[PDB]
Amino acid sequence: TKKRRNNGRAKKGRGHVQPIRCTNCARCVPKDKAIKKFVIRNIVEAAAVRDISEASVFDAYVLPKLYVKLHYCVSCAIHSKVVRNRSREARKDRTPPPRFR
Template sequence: MPSKRRNNGRSSHGRGHTAIVRCSNCSRSVPKDKVIKRFQVRNIVDDSSQRDLREASVYATFMLPKLYMKMLYCVSCAIHGRIVRVRNKKLRASPEGRIYVRPNFGGKGAGNSFAVCEFLFFLLMFFVCFLFLFLCVCC
């Protein structure tokens, strides 16, 4: 019978059995090599509370510690929570499809790529004008 994926959805090459872990979302038992792993780094408090703490603090340069969590998702929760996406057969088989780039759902850096390109364009134009003026003055 043909298999859907090259690795059959697991990364246990040469191992018969792997440990069982629990999904962070629904507590389903999932083999450790099949689980989708994401490392999440968050601030302990939100930005507004962080600003209040900074204003009330005696120390000028006190940095609040961050919260480091390794999230383990079963396949169902990862698809439902948009951690991973369903890919068609051609994309799964191609080398480009194996490299997964997480989509940015309006988070940091969303929509400002045009602004960055525009800034770089103006910077380049400024440099060209400056170079032109410099050459005119020197000659």
């Protein structure tokens, strides 16, 4: 039986794409199938900045940022527990939740 309509990817008009090496593994995944995450993040996140802010000289001097873009492989994603399994019915709900988290 056909498990998913798109075969866990986004190949409808094209035909081929360049493979990527995993970060945690090196598993080769098609970029279009592969998970893409644009993580920008403070070199110091929240707990550290309060501690580190003590370490700064100037009162309120802005910190630069750490502009990452991550790609993981699948088995790593479930292991690292970024994504959960869903039901057959909920599967089609492809809208991501609002911006509460």
